[PDB]
A paper describes a structure:
Holliday junctions (HJs) are DNA structures in which two duplexes are joined by the exchange of strands. The removal of HJs can occur through actions of specialized nucleases, termed resolvases. The model enzyme from this group is the bacterial resolvase RuvC. It belongs to the retroviral integrase superfamily that has a characteristic RNase H fold and catalytic mechanism that involves two divalent metal ions.
To obtain more detailed insights into substrate recognition by the enzyme, we performed  new X-ray diffraction experiments that are described in the Methods section and resulted in better resolution of 3.4 Å. Many of the side chains from the wedge directly stack with DNA base pairs that are closest to the junction point. The higher resolution X-ray diffraction data revealed that they cause deformations of these base pairs. Specifically, they buckle the base pairs by 17.1, 8.9, 34.9, and 33.8 degrees for DNA arms A1, A2, B1, and B2, respectively (A1 and A2 are the cleaved arms). Further analysis of the new 3.4 Å structure also indicated that the RuvC–HJ complex did not adopt a fully catalytic configuration. Namely, the distance between the phosphorus atoms of the scissile phosphates and C-α atoms of the catalytic Asp7 residues was greater than 8 Å, whereas in the structures of related retroviral integrase superfamily enzymes, it is within the range of 7.25–7.5 Å (PDB ID: 1ZBI20, 3O3G21, and 4E7I22). This implies that structural rearrangement of the complex must occur to achieve the catalytically active configuration. In the new RuvC–HJ X-ray structure, the DNA sequence that is located near the active sites only partially matched the cleavage consensus, and the complex did not correspond to the catalytic configuration. At the same time, the scissile phosphates were positioned too far from the active sites for catalysis to occur, suggesting that tension that is introduced at the exchange point of the HJ substrate displaced scissile phosphates from the active sites.
Numbering used by the authors:
A (entry chain B): 0 to 20, 23 to 166
B (entry chain A): 0 to 21, 26 to 116, 122 to 166
The structure:
Amino acid sequence: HMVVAGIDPGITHLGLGVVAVKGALKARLLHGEVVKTSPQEPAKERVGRIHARVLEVLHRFRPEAVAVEEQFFYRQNELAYKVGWALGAVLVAAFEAGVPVYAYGPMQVKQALAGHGHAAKEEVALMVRGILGLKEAPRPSHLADALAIALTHAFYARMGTAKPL
Amino acid sequence: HMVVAGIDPGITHLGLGVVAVELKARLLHGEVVKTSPQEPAKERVGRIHARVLEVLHRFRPEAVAVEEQFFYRQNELAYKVGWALGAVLVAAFEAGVPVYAYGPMQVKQALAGKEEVALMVRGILGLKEAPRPSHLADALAIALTHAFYARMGTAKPL
DNA sequence: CAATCGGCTTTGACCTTTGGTCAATCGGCAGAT
DNA sequence: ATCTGCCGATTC
DNA sequence: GAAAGCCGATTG
Ligand SMILES: [Cl-]
Ligand code: NA
């Protein structure tokens, strides 16, 4: 039985999910959340709330690990910058919590969750509803990913191949 | 007396300087924060946030000004600079100081018609030698660049 | 309010009836004072 | 220790 | 040659 938080990082919508797992991938959704900020706030405050929110959730659920998604490529560099900001407030927060951080990328999730190298966006989210025993598929997109990441971290942790940051 | 913190953001060397102002001004504190890839990323960003926060509590500045490049020939770079930036803003948020951002264009041309500016800061403050490392002179350019535009009401908040 | 949508994907200086080129970023590592 | 240097830039 | 996320503006 282990508690993983999963984060799909981004400055506009930040996916936040806590789950709980030992035999096959069977886990139970503890918390789900999407942090939203608008380009109307001073950046200090957009990333200021991101940090507060993750801290509350890390204190409340005392997980064993944070897992974040890491995109292998951003089309323009101001995207990578700002997604970078939000990972910063996350990193600071996991440091204040002493929770250790692991990052996986968009193909390690596919390889773990659907068992295939290239699953469909529909092919993973179904594998998530199953690992979680959930009525409907979880929404929005960014929260679906966040839960996928948390489960992908648990998959590779069961094989002792986890990727710290 | 306008006291203004300047930052050259970066995950490996992060320039941090504080400056008070009366058409010129004096130096209050300087340091480069250093962190190494042998550290867990949570600890590198950790220290950067811890250390910026302390400076802001001490000197209670009226503005943090950070530099902001627009070119990065690779994404992995702009990503990690963002980490270190993010740690800053989290701290600026806690400290409650407003953040302002200037690009190298409005720093070069806010002070000198390349190295022509990096020497001017030795003057606009008053120093035997120009400052080292590079990253600290950058940090100090920025704090001045802000206070300059702060007097022309074209301060650009982030 | 809260969600859905489509467009955008570095910027600037220089010279080269005319749109061409070119350069800047910084993080990891290795080796020396 | 603290600095100076050169090299390399997305993955399937 | 594909890959994603930010922003600004539009609805119900
Ligand atoms: Cl979303
Ligand atoms: Na601000």
